[PDB]
Amino acid sequence: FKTETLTQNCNEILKRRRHVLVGISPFNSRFSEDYIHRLIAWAVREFQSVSVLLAGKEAANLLEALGTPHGKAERKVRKEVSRNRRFAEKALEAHGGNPEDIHTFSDFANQTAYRNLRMEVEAAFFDQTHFRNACLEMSHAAILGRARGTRMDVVEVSADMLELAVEYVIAELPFFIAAPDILGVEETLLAYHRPWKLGEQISRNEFAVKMRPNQGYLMVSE
Template identity: 30%
Template sequence: MSESLISTKPSPYQALPFSDRCRRLWLRGDHLLIGVSPGNSYFSARRIAELVTWGREFFDAVDVVHADLHVDAQFEAFGYTPEHAKRRAAKEVRTTARRIERGLAEAGLNRVAMHALSDFLAAPAYQRLHAEVRRALREDPVLREAAEGMARAFLAGRLPTGVAADAGQLAAGLRYICAELPFFLDTPALLGRASSISCYHVELPLTPVLFGRSEGLRAAPTQGYAVVRPVEEPSPEATEPLAA
């Protein structure tokens, strides 16, 4: 991982690009993608407003994408009836979308757009990338292990402490993750950007697989990743912050 923080002073957030290549893409400043998961309290309307405002200091354009696919499958895996699962999922997705809309309205910025994952289902680039992900999950044990680790970490928030996800819950989590992964592989192809940085507030188990190896399924050369988090959160990997 790159050890150089990127920040401005004063600034509410700091960025830690995963690698030197990710850092170079960040410094190009073409595009930042902010992914928002339904039911994640981290992404309040205020935080979204802060993130997009902060992101526009560095990037020509910012997009916010929220997950709305396979959310009902997760509720079903936790014992909800199909009808109840669909209602709960729809409610979570609507709540997330409204929170993003409030955040973007509060930020009041141009060149910041909001999308749902389902908006891309018919796009050839998304279909190609999604097929590559599904194939890699079958054929690439390293990626499969990392994806399952990511799914377990995600599902842990819905399970009692110490209880592991069962096979059905894990499969539902993997379908959800599979739907998101095209934006970690090639956002430029999906949104027509020269290059892009996908960001999240933690490093995900799949990050080293997609951005740190030289074989198997991995991110496009114009796709980067960075952990973006509040400045007050300590960063054990970081050395001296760098002003952008």
């Protein structure tokens, strides 16, 4: 795996190799069982501690945006997240990591740190049109791949679909800006295979949202 970081501060965290938070979504086509094993093996080889972050309940909003009824969506999310969890448990075990170190982004709904971060992200979403637009672009990106990879037609992504999907973005973002606050680690890099444009904007202080100094984003590529 080749890696690229958001800023220079991200590079300092990377050099210490203390902890990586490996992101996995069952609704992104990158994440086969085989890839999850290769990715987690890499993470355990390269970092002192490895945790996994799975999609939370708000993944159902992505499926609903693409036409799945709510009840069916909840069931599909529970199923596929459980499947991903099992793959990650086996991969962590196989390589000397701890299969308990797996979380979804909705596991901390009642936790003070997560709630504080959610409030910060939501406040900016409602108050700042430029942040709202950046979030809507993330929500577009969260459904577009799936819309094209799993359908025969060319479905047009509507404003209504983005508004439904963006709950997913709001729910995950606390882990993109301050995962250590939530997980109780000294510092981390969130590792994922897509670039994250909004992260660069956040680090430049373009919004009423802050990238914590002990958080970085690590783009991984095979």
